[PDB]
């Protein structure tokens, strides 16, 4: 089977050529399966499909990493690139906004904060 | 359209429909000479700008 760490060391054009060759091999395997074949050759169909999935996955990571690099430290980034938590979590108040306090509240906290105290018998 | 018709009819309704003295004391503003003299003396004491 194709190794993912080996695939990640090659350029996108080479990966596309490998994907095209694998698709052609898969088509030929399907043709032989239709017009008579052996189980040894039929078992290669699943391996070819997995290798095609691996190549497509590796291309996807490369494209998404390039998009993340391009959109690094940018005000607005693609929706698929940004957070993927729940809808309520996404629109919930940020910790900074929830911790915002008025000047009067800040002065009250600074001058009269909760003290650590103890009692004796 | 509706907004042009409304504003013109509002002006007509204000011109008719006798106005109470508290609101009718308006509509008689300063004359040309007095207004331009007031604004001329007003333009000297401008309340600064952001740059200055």
């Amino acid at each position: 089977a194709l190794k993912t760490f080996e695939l990640r060391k090659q350029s996108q054009e080479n990966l596309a050529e490998q994907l095209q060759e694998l698709r052609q091999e898969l088509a030929s395997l399907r043709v032989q399966k239709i017009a008579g074949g052996s189980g040894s050759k039929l078992s290669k169909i699943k391996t070819t499909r997995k290798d095609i999935a691996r190549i497509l996955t590796v291309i996807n990571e490369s494209n998404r990493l390039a998009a993340r690099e391009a959109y690094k430290n940018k005000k607005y980034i693609p929706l698929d690139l940004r957070q993927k938590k729940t809808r309520a979590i996404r629109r919930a108040l940020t910790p900074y906004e929830q911790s915002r306090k008025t000047l009067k509240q800040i002065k009250k906290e600074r001058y009269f904060p909760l003290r650590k105290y103890a009692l004796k018998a | 359209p509706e907004y042009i018709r409304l504003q013109r009819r509002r002006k007509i309704l204000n011109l008719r429909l006798k106005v109470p003295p508290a609101i009718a004391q308006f509509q008689k503003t300063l004359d040309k000479n007095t207004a331009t003299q007031v604004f001329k003396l007003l333009n000297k004491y401008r309340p600064e700008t952001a740059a200055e």
Binding site: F112, P113, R115, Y117, A118, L119, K120, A121 | -
Partner: protein, 104 residues
Amino acid sequence: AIRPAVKPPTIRYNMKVRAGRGFTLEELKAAGVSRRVASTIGIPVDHRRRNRSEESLQRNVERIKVYLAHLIVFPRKAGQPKKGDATDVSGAEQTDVAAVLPIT
């Protein structure tokens, strides 16, 4: 938290003493505790209750004084005891307030 001693408001119960919600502003002033510092040191403040009798005023004032005497106030900055802070916070442990100041 330390609670004041109050009289229930009916003839069926005015002969008893129970625990109140918080100490009045007059009681805090008489005991020498500011209303802002009372919350920080654990003294509840009740702005609605008032002292119509010197008996109730003194009864709660002595309770605040006993609480202050038995209270250890840790310094805001460790090793730098300020006004009212305790220099012997080493022997501090969690004790029941009513075990030293019960309602009588």
